[PDB]
Amino acid sequence: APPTTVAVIEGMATGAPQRVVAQADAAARVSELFVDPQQRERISRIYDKTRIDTRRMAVDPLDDEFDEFRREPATIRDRMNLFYQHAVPLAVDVAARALDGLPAPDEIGQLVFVTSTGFIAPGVDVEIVKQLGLPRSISRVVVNFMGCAAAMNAIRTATNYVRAHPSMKALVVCIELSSVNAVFADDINDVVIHSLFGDGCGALVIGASQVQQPLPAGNVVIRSSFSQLLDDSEDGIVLGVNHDGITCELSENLPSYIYRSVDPVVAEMLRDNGLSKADIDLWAIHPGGPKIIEQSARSLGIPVGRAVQSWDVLAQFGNMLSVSLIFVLEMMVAQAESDKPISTGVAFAFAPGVTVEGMLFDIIR
Amino acid sequence: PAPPTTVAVIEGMATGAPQRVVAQADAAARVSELFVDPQQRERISRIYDKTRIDTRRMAVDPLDDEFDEFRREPATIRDRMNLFYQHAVPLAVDVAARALDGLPYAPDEIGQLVFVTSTGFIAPGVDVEIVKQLGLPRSISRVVVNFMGCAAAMNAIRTATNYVRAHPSMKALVVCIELSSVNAVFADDINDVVIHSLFGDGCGALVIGASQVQQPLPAGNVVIRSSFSQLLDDSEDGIVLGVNHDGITCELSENLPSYIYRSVDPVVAEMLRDNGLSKADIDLWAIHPGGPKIIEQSARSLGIPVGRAVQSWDVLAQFGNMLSVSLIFVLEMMVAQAESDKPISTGVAFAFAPGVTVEGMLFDIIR
Numbered sequence: 066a067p068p069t070t071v072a073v074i075e076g077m078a079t080g081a082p083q084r085v086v087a088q089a090d091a092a093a094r095v096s097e098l099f100v101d102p103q104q105r106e107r108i109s110r111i112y113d114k115t116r117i118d119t120r121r122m123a124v125d126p127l128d129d130e131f132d133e134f135r136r137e138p139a140t141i142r143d144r145m146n147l148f149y150q151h152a153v154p155l156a157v158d159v160a161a162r163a164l165d166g167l168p169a170p171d172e173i174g175q176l177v178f179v180t181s182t183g184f185i186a187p188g189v190d191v192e193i194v195k196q197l198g199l200p201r202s203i204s205r206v207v208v209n210f211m212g213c214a215a216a217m218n219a220i221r222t223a224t225n226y227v228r229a230h231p232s233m234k235a236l237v238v239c240i241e242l243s244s245v246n247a248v249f250a251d252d253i254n255d256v257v258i259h260s261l262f263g264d265g266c267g268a269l270v271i272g273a274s275q276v277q278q279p280l281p282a283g284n285v286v287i288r289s290s291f292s293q294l295l296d297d298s299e300d301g302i303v304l305g306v307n308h309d310g311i312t313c314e315l316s317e318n319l320p321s322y323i324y325r326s327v328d329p330v331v332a333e334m335l336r337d338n339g340l341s342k343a344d345i346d347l348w349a350i351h352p353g354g355p356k357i358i359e360q361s362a363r364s365l366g367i368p369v370g371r372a373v374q375s376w377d378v379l380a381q382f383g384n385m386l387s388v389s390l391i392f393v394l395e396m397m398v399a400q401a402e403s404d405k406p407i408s409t410g411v412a413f414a415f416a417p418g419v420t421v422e423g424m425l426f427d428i429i430r
Numbered sequence: 431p432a433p434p435t436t437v438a439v440i441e442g443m444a445t446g447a448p449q450r451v452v453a454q455a456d457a458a459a460r461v462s463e464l465f466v467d468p469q470q471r472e473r474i475s476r477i478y479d480k481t482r483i484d485t486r487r488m489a490v491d492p493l494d495d496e497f498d499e500f501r502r503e504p505a506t507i508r509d510r511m512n513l514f515y516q517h518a519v520p521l522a523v524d525v526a527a528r529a530l531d532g533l534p535y536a537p538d539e540i541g542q543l544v545f546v547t548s549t550g551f552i553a554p555g556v557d558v559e560i561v562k563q564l565g566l567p568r569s570i571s572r573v574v575v576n577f578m579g580c581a582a583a584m585n586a587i588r589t590a591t592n593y594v595r596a597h598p599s600m601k602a603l604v605v606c607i608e609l610s611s612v613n614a615v616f617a618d619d620i621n622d623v624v625i626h627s628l629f630g631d632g633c634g635a636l637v638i639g640a641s642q643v644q645q646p647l648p649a650g651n652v653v654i655r656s657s658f659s660q661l662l663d664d665s666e667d668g669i670v671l672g673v674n675h676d677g678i679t680c681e682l683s684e685n686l687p688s689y690i691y692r693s694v695d696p697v698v699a700e701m702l703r704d705n706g707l708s709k710a711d712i713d714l715w716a717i718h719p720g721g722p723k724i725i726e727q728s729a730r731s732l733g734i735p736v737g738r739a740v741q742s743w744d745v746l747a748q749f750g751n752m753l754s755v756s757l758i759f760v761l762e763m764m765v766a767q768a769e770s771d772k773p774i775s776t777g778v779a780f781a782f783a784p785g786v787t788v789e790g791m792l793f794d795i796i797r
């Protein structure tokens with residue numbers, strides 16, 4: 066007999082590096098390194114097509130001082146040291162603020178640490194424990210290279226924890242510093258990647274509640290969680306470690322995989338929870354790029370602009386991989402879409418596989 | 431709400447490793463050749479002898495000159511990760527298939543896959559090929575636990591136990607694979623040679639389900655009673671993992687044995703007390719076979735004779751240090767050869783991760 070308890074987000078917080086990089090300025094830095102004017106207009110037409118206004122970088126890519134370093138080979142170890150150095154102070158602040166809204170450090174039983182842009186042990190999860198004075202006996206899980214949908218896998222892990230240990234809470238911390246892996250382009254993909262990815266941190270505090278028990282406004286109930294590895298999509302999203310930093314490779318066919326897959330997956334899931342698409346008030350589509358939001362919406366047969374919080378996060382921060390969906394959730398909690406006392410929502414994102422990960426959730430108003 | 435009164439059971443287990451055996455004597459010969467001073471070659475042979483390792487398994491033949499060009503060449507990390515994938519998949523899939531072959535054929539009951547490695551980094555990775563080639567459900571929950579060192583199987587089991595305790599109808603599959611051989615480079619200092627003397631290759635897989643407590647279980651099942659974890663202080667240097675241009679690396683402090691001596695007893699003592707036991711109630715000590723000093727200092731801390739941990743010594747001797755995998759090997763041995771007449775054997779497993787952290791389980795083997 067499964068426990069009849071449910072997982073609740075009781076606490077959230079976001080953060081990002083102080084350094085803003087205007088998309089206009091980034092396109093200038095790149096266009097300078099082209100001669101043929103037919104090629105310079107293609108660069109500017111790429112950066113304009115991103116529908117990104119700003120990003121936050123831990124390391125300024127529009128800074129000449131480290132152009133020597135970013136061209137130099139065999140720097141991966143230095144970049145991982147660089148990741149640790151920025152990640153700790155950012156991670157610890159965001160986590161501290163996710164907890165600051167709430168009553169007892171000895172009740173936090175699990176820390177789930179998510180990144181696909183950092184690889185170093187002992188890592189940030191340890192400094193989080195020490196600097197926040199969490200229990201030395203806390204369960205730690207490090208989820209790596211699960212891409213942009215990694216927060217969904219982390220939440221599912223946290224949900225399993227608190228449902229097996231209802232007295233206890235789980236702390237989920239995601240941090241992505243794409244900027245630490247920035248290099249001078251060889252291929253088209255490289256320039257496209259460098260045009261989209263930014264930096265951010267998000268943190269969640271998850272606890273268990275008895276079903277039907279009353280909950281304060283702003284709590285998010287995780288009702289249901291779904292995964293789907295698709296066929297003939299291995300090329301879709303590819304992550305690798307190079308001598309000069311971690312890399313991401315996105316197939317030209319990725320938008321086609323997204324169009325094909327989203328509706329059947331989301332349709333089956335909703336049917337399984339006795340819902341139709343007309344019962345969803347909130348669509349938290351992963352803001353990975355314009356193409357990902359566009360093709361996700363077209364698959365679902367909803368107007369592209371319906372996912373306004375996704376568009377807003379892309380515009381202000383770009384693609385922050387795992388973190389992006391914590392930002393979308395914070396916005397949805399912060400600005401209610403209607404008068405309803407509960408808002409029902411679907412979140413999903415794409416990981417290597419290709420895999421579709423998502424949640425059905427309720428925000429209490 | 432009240433916590434579920436269910437317990438996690440290992441219902442399935444299997445090990446594997448590369449076909450290729452490499453005698454410790456032969457490995458020491460190749461390494462001594464690449465050195466000049468006869469006083470230096472004495473130290474190398476006395477290092478390899480001191481490991482108390484007889485054989486290891488390599489996916490990649492390290493005493494093979496075609497590979498020596500490559501392992502001197504810089505900026506090869508991507509190629510080595512491609513090399514990891516290429517060997518890992520066939521090995522991973524076989525070991526997982528054999529962990530499941532022990533049970534009624536129902537792939538649709540596997541709800542979680544936890545994939546553990548600190549020697550490989552590539553997406554989409556082995557976890558995906560495992561799902562496809564075994565025809566596990568496309569809807570299966572996947573978690574990739576990376577760079578949690580040699581105690582990573584303990585973190586994985588804890589994760590799997592939380593899953594099946596929240597989803598009692600469902601089972602979780604834990605797969606650990608380490609190929610140290612794909613990160614082999616020519617030594618610089620001392621740590622380099624010591625690391626290259628200890629680490630080997632292996633794969634282990636576990637199938638975990640939930641039982642109602644006191645409900646009867648077949649012989650060979652392992653009951654996970656408790657999991658425990660302890661981050662220690664002034665021990666950051668103890669165990670360090672990093673990614674280099676020419677492969678993943680490991681750095682072990684000269685003070686690591688001191689951290690192990692000081693940590694193990696208090697941690698294990700408190701844990702046992704909390705489950706209503708003393709050290710005199712333990713029948714099985716599954717100390718992580720990381721090296722002689724780790725087994726020795728663990729035993730000295732606990733105040734048990736060093737040779738008491740027989741299966742740890744045997745796994746080191748035959749396979750060396752396989753990080754996360756090593757303790758699945760120790761568990762298989764303990765299941766395979768009963769230590770006494772008792773119908774249940776109670777045991778403690780623990781290992782060391784970056785932090786430094788002590789991770790472990792209290793467990794019962796059904797006889």
Ligand SMILES: CCCCCCCC(=O)O
Nearest residue numbers: 243244246247259262311
């Ligand atoms: C997932 C790691 C890839 C990051 C590449 C650098 C992109 C940028 O920040 O411009």
Ligand SMILES: CCCCCCCC(=O)O
Nearest residue numbers: 610611613614626629680
């Ligand atoms: C954690 C990775 C360690 C790589 C060292 C290689 C040891 C060997 O295979 O001889």
